[PDB]
């Protein structure tokens, strides 16, 4: 059973940073990637970026470059997203999801439950 388990909701102050985690289990973590999505309260979905721990490959939406930093720890099958210089626009639910390989399988097939960030 594939599972992605996200860290708990957080309250943060403007100007602070936070580091959100996404723990993967039930499959070979390094055979796939992890991708992150933002949803502001009441709003749509936005793609942040992806990371592939085996090759270290990353891709970012330019909108989030230097707001979001994606890392991964192969030794614990955990992906991280650090959000810096927080503002009220950063209040959202952040999801992680699996990212797949060439051929288009396993893209956004499993999701974490989301982490709510509230910037005060």
């Amino acid at each position: 059973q594939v599972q992605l388990q996200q860290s708990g909701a957080e309250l943060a102050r403007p100007g602070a940073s936070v580091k959100l985690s996404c723990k993967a289990s039930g499959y070979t973590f390094t055979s796939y990637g992890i991708t992150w999505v933002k949803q502001r309260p009441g709003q749509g979905l936005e793609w942040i970026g992806e990371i592939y721990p085996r090759s270290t490959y990353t891709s970012y939406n330019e909108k989030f470059k230097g707001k979001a930093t994606l890392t991964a720890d192969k030794s614990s099958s955990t992906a991280y997203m650090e959000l810096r210089s927080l503002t009220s626009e950063d209040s959202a639910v952040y999801f992680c999801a699996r990212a797949g390989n060439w051929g288009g399988e396993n893209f956004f097939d499993y999701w974490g439950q989301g982490t709510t960030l509230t910037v005060s």
Binding site: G44, L45, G103, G104, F107, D109, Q113
Partner: protein, 113 residues
């Protein structure tokens, strides 16, 4: 981003057991040189994570009811929802994966009468 692919969705309360179709248009073709069309449909139920319904334009994801079907041309797409149920309530999104950045439509809400 000025050059990002823009995805537009149509708007729809649906009577239980009736049917709706949701449409999605892309500003560029999502048909890649490999012959596949990189268009996803998601349902995000309230308080839940988005669920992949359809990928590669027309392939139903594992676990998804055959009440959902996807079709399209490469620039225009449709999600058919048969025999609508309470569990179908939420926001439907289409998403393209043909080019970076990946982009989503603005969502289509479905509410049950």
């Amino acid at each position: 981003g000025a050059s990002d692919i823009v995805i537009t969705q149509d708007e729809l309360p649906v009577t239980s057991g009736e049917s709706v179709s949701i449409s999605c248009r892309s500003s560029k073709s999502l048909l890649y040189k490999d012959g596949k069309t990189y268009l996803n449909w998601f349902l995000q139920r309230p308080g839940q994570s988005p669920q992949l319904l359809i990928y590669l334009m027309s392939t139903r994801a594992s676990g998804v009811s055959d009440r959902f079907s996807g079709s399209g041309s490469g620039t225009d797409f449709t999600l058919e929802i048969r025999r609508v149920k309470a569990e179908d309530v939420g926001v439907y999104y289409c998403q393209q994966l043909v080019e970076y950045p990946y982009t989503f439509g603005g969502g289509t809400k479905l509410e049950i009468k």
